[PDB]
Design a protein around this nucleic acid. Structure first.
Ligand SMILES: [Mg+2]
Ligand SMILES: [Mg+2]
Ligand SMILES: [Mg+2]
Ligand SMILES: [Mg+2]
Ligand SMILES: [Mg+2]
Ligand SMILES: [Mg+2]
Ligand SMILES: [Mg+2]
Ligand SMILES: [Mg+2]
Ligand SMILES: [Mg+2]
Ligand SMILES: [Mg+2]
Ligand SMILES: [Mg+2]
Ligand SMILES: [Mg+2]
Ligand SMILES: [Mg+2]
Ligand SMILES: [Mg+2]
Ligand SMILES: [Mg+2]
Ligand SMILES: [Mg+2]
Ligand SMILES: [Mg+2]
Ligand SMILES: [Mg+2]
Ligand SMILES: [Mg+2]
Ligand SMILES: [Mg+2]
Ligand SMILES: [Mg+2]
Ligand SMILES: [Mg+2]
Ligand SMILES: [Mg+2]
Ligand SMILES: [Mg+2]
Ligand SMILES: [Mg+2]
Ligand SMILES: [Mg+2]
Ligand SMILES: [Mg+2]
Ligand SMILES: [Mg+2]
Ligand SMILES: [Mg+2]
Ligand SMILES: [Mg+2]
Ligand SMILES: [Mg+2]
Ligand SMILES: [Mg+2]
Ligand SMILES: [Mg+2]
Ligand SMILES: [Mg+2]
Ligand SMILES: [Mg+2]
Ligand SMILES: [Mg+2]
Ligand SMILES: [Mg+2]
Ligand SMILES: [Mg+2]
Ligand SMILES: [Mg+2]
Ligand SMILES: [Mg+2]
Ligand SMILES: [Mg+2]
Ligand SMILES: [Mg+2]
Ligand SMILES: [Mg+2]
Ligand SMILES: [Mg+2]
Ligand SMILES: [Mg+2]
Ligand SMILES: [Mg+2]
Ligand SMILES: [Mg+2]
Ligand SMILES: [Mg+2]
Ligand SMILES: [Mg+2]
Ligand SMILES: [Mg+2]
Ligand SMILES: [Mg+2]
Ligand SMILES: [Mg+2]
Ligand SMILES: [Mg+2]
Ligand SMILES: [Mg+2]
Ligand SMILES: [Mg+2]
Ligand SMILES: [Mg+2]
Ligand SMILES: [Mg+2]
Ligand SMILES: [Mg+2]
Ligand SMILES: [Mg+2]
Ligand SMILES: [Mg+2]
Ligand SMILES: [Mg+2]
Ligand SMILES: [Mg+2]
Ligand SMILES: [Mg+2]
Ligand SMILES: [Mg+2]
Ligand SMILES: [Mg+2]
Ligand SMILES: [Mg+2]
Ligand SMILES: [Mg+2]
Ligand SMILES: [Mg+2]
Ligand SMILES: [Mg+2]
Ligand SMILES: [Mg+2]
Ligand SMILES: [Mg+2]
Ligand SMILES: [Mg+2]
Ligand SMILES: [Mg+2]
Ligand SMILES: [Mg+2]
Ligand SMILES: [Mg+2]
Ligand SMILES: [Mg+2]
Lengths: 23, 58, 78
RNA sequence: UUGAAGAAUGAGCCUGCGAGUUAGUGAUGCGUGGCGAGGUUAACCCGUGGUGGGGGAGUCGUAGCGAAAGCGAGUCCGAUA
RNA sequence: UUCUCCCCGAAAUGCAUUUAGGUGCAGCGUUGCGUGGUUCUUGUUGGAGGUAGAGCACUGGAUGGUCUAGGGGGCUUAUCGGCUUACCGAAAUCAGCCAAACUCCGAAUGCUGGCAAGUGUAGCGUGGCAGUGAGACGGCGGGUGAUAAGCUUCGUCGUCGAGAGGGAAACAGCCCAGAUCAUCAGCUAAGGCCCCUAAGUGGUGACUCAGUGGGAAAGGAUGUGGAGUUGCGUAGACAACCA
RNA sequence: GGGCUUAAGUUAUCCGCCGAAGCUGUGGCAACCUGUGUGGUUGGGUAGGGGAGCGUCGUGUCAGUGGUGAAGCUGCCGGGU
RNA sequence: GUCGCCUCCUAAAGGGUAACGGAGGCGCCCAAAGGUUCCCUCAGCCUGGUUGGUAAUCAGGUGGUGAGUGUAAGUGCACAAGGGGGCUUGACUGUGAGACUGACAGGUCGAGCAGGGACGAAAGUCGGGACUAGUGAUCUGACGGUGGCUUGUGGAUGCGCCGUCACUCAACGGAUAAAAGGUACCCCGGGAUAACAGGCUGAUCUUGCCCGAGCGCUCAUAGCGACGGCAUGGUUUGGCACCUCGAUGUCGGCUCGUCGCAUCCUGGGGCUGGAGUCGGUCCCAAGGGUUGGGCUGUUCGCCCAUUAAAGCGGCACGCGAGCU
RNA sequence: UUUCCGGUGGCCAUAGUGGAAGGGAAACACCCGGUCCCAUUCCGAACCCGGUCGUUAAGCCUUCCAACGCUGAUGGUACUGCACGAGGGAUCGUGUGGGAGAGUAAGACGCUGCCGGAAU
């Protein structure tokens, strides 16, 4: 799903270091 | 013996309990705290164990 | 639906070496719990009914080879 | 509640009211006071004048071990082990 | 389930349960008394191992080759015996392989002793009082599941829970960092410096022209820069143009 | 998000700065440790444990006070962690 | 289906470690299959040999563990713990330094000593079995022994102690000695937990795509697309149990629309074509339009008569404080 | 003292396996008997007893042979503690420590203690 894909891809932001709650 | 100079540059939060206990044994208590230790292999070992948290000099 | 013909297991028995090399022991102290003689009784070490190796005397535990066997000895304390 | 600004619950508003109490010479700690190898009374009696005095029956401490007879700084299992 | 502040500060685990949203015991909190480096970290020194990896000694799985017992098909024709065996083929052997329940091997770590140094005031004994025994996500190593789930169930560390502040547009669990109060001082962390928005429309050298940056696969494509190897070539190459 | 290729994109590198309740400076408070002239360490916090208090009502005692105005209510000006 | 116990794997080289994870076993057996002492070495293979064959018994050669082990599996065991003979009862009584392992109940090992034995020339070994399952707390009752106690005394009787017995208490830490069902007539915390919707996921479904065996007289690619491969969508069936159980009303029609384009018609264009007429297919394109009836509660579907056409989907499978 | 040999340990293949050559003074051994102790789940084969004639054929001993097996670095690689990083995702990379297995060069036809023997 689009929402799931965006949620998973949000972990690629700079301040996060490849990790994010709920992937 | 060259009197190693060790200062803490990163916090102990979220580090491993090994690393936190190593900092305690080195006597560092805050970020920016500095201690002087002899050029002894045990202290070199502590420094290399927490090498990502401290910097060392002479 | 379906079912499993498995799910049974035995309780943990807690085998293994209980006193490692150089560790000071008293007479009668258990050195290793085991099934079969993976370690044979050496000098100063007795073997029990369930193949437990225990100390026959005070001293330090060492692991070695006696002829062709892996053995556990208790060197008498200096 | 893993997680609530939550579209989970309750509350319209104010004022008043509304939930860890009390009784045991209960059990067990602690603080403190008294006395101390002793401590302490209960009922009850006297004080119609009370909160004071008497009352040591009891009760805890003073020796333990054993199922017990028993023995006792030992005792019990045991063979005076 | 009603006033305040000071100090410390959890658990959502194990075992058992007519038990599973309850409870007892242990774990973890606090506190009195006692014992004092016994704890912990690092170094050094010594132990037991069978995981990762790897391997084919074993047990299974397996590809091809050689070779072959022995089975199938034929005839001459068979009681044989022969031609065949151009078909099948155990085993053995050669070469390449596979494995949570394979191992001739075998780490890193971890665990556990001795010694040394460092160290908060850690550890331990024994009493008083608990709460908790519904966990969550992330990293790493696994099982269940479909190479699924913000899934489920373990190992381990972290945060959240019970954590404000900075970053992540917003955004319990990610990153930085643990808030004693005051300050219209300074330096930094992560992250940032065109404007929103504090600080560089920074310097120098490359690349991109797709708004790629600012989501995606098998596959496809004279996009573009750079680095090779190699064939042919002023015996005259590749195109274009006359037989 | 505006907008950005005339990078405000990617990348290598160099020089600066911004940036938190982190660190430092300064002032106040507090817990604990220590030889007791110093100083050191510490003070996010739910369930929960420990410690010390504020306010209300009654009451023993002492000192009182009140129609030259108590309680209560309600302003203002102050005080304490 | 499972519940206690044992072995292996999962288990991440100590120990421990969960799932309705993956494999199996146990509720015994043995008077020798226990103790001791001495002796022995297997399976397989090759050769020869009456019956006799792959394989009985025999001989020689080879062969170190691939046989064997009462019984699962692992760890062991060839020095044998495997095979055989002799003699035996230690498958003892009184004990247990010191440890292992559990929250505990508990589970396990054990040197040394005494008594009285077995075996061995002795050294020595023997408190069952190569090891680890073959088991059940307490209560209550029972039998044997003992004689501690006995309510005035002596008896008796009863009890205590020691040994032992009686539970598929198998839901195996064992609620009672004693127990099955119905509730749509039902009544009185949880979104800790199901049905509906939302969310995640995308197996399935769906829509594409890559490869091109083949089919298409001929001719992979007019048009098709085998075997395989890669994804989209989130509307199908599911998986999950995150939201709501101090209420998020659940099918179809009616009414009112709005949005997507994966276009039914109308508009445009390629390739084929295709004589023309028509068609079919890959692009563009969502402006407008997209009928009325029979059957069934239906969605779906079939049918009748039309039409330029009778599209597919989203909006809590749009829309019950709008209706049905 | 040395050499050689017989016993009895230790390391447990660098020692084994296989092939070749040679040796016995004491010793070991095969060998010769079974009368005697004793013995065969039959057998004086073995065990045991009595001899040491015969014999180095074998055991045993010495020398030689890397042939099978065994031993085996250095360097690299896998993996990995800690710290990070990159992909839509299976998964991958780097820093800092540790670091195999296999394979390669190579080693190796054993080493060592005590007692006894015959000679020196
Ligand atoms: Mg999808
Ligand atoms: Mg035994
Ligand atoms: Mg036994
Ligand atoms: Mg919830
Ligand atoms: Mg609300
Ligand atoms: Mg609201
Ligand atoms: Mg509720
Ligand atoms: Mg309400
Ligand atoms: Mg109210
Ligand atoms: Mg008296
Ligand atoms: Mg605190
Ligand atoms: Mg592997
Ligand atoms: Mg508890
Ligand atoms: Mg519970
Ligand atoms: Mg739980
Ligand atoms: Mg759970
Ligand atoms: Mg958990
Ligand atoms: Mg996790
Ligand atoms: Mg998995
Ligand atoms: Mg989860
Ligand atoms: Mg909570
Ligand atoms: Mg926290
Ligand atoms: Mg925060
Ligand atoms: Mg923030
Ligand atoms: Mg913010
Ligand atoms: Mg600055
Ligand atoms: Mg920075
Ligand atoms: Mg703003
Ligand atoms: Mg510029
Ligand atoms: Mg610039
Ligand atoms: Mg594009
Ligand atoms: Mg884009
Ligand atoms: Mg792409
Ligand atoms: Mg500041
Ligand atoms: Mg601060
Ligand atoms: Mg300061
Ligand atoms: Mg505090
Ligand atoms: Mg703080
Ligand atoms: Mg509290
Ligand atoms: Mg007056
Ligand atoms: Mg009053
Ligand atoms: Mg383990
Ligand atoms: Mg481990
Ligand atoms: Mg668990
Ligand atoms: Mg036997
Ligand atoms: Mg018995
Ligand atoms: Mg003991
Ligand atoms: Mg057991
Ligand atoms: Mg005896
Ligand atoms: Mg005798
Ligand atoms: Mg047996
Ligand atoms: Mg036996
Ligand atoms: Mg009962
Ligand atoms: Mg009487
Ligand atoms: Mg007895
Ligand atoms: Mg049970
Ligand atoms: Mg019962
Ligand atoms: Mg009815
Ligand atoms: Mg109800
Ligand atoms: Mg839920
Ligand atoms: Mg709940
Ligand atoms: Mg649902
Ligand atoms: Mg909803
Ligand atoms: Mg669904
Ligand atoms: Mg579910
Ligand atoms: Mg769950
Ligand atoms: Mg409501
Ligand atoms: Mg279109
Ligand atoms: Mg339309
Ligand atoms: Mg439009
Ligand atoms: Mg139908
Ligand atoms: Mg529609
Ligand atoms: Mg609906
Ligand atoms: Mg409505
Ligand atoms: Mg090697
Ligand atoms: Mg190597």
């Amino acid at each position: 799903g689009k929402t799931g894909r965006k949620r998973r891809a949000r972990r690629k932001k700079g301040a996060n270091h490849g990790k994010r709650p709920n992937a | 013996m060259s009197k190693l100079k060790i200062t803490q540059i990163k916090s102990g939060i979220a580090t491993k309990p090994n690393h936190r206990e190593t900092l305690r044994s080195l006597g560092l208590k805050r970020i920016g705290d500095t201690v002087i230790k002899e050029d002894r292999p045990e202290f070199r070992g502590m420094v290399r164990t927490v090498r990502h948290l401290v910097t060392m000099e002479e | 639906a379906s079912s499993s013909r498995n799910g049974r297991d035995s309780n943990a028995q807690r085998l293994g070496v209980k006193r490692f090399g150089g560790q000071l022991v008293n007479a009668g102290e258990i050195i290793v719990r085991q099934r079969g003689t993976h370690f044979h009784p050496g000098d100063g070490v007795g073997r029990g009914g369930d193949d437990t190796l225990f100390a026959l005397r005070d001293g330090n535990v060492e692991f070695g080879t006696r002829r062709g066997r892996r053995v556990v000895n208790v060197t008498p304390v200096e």
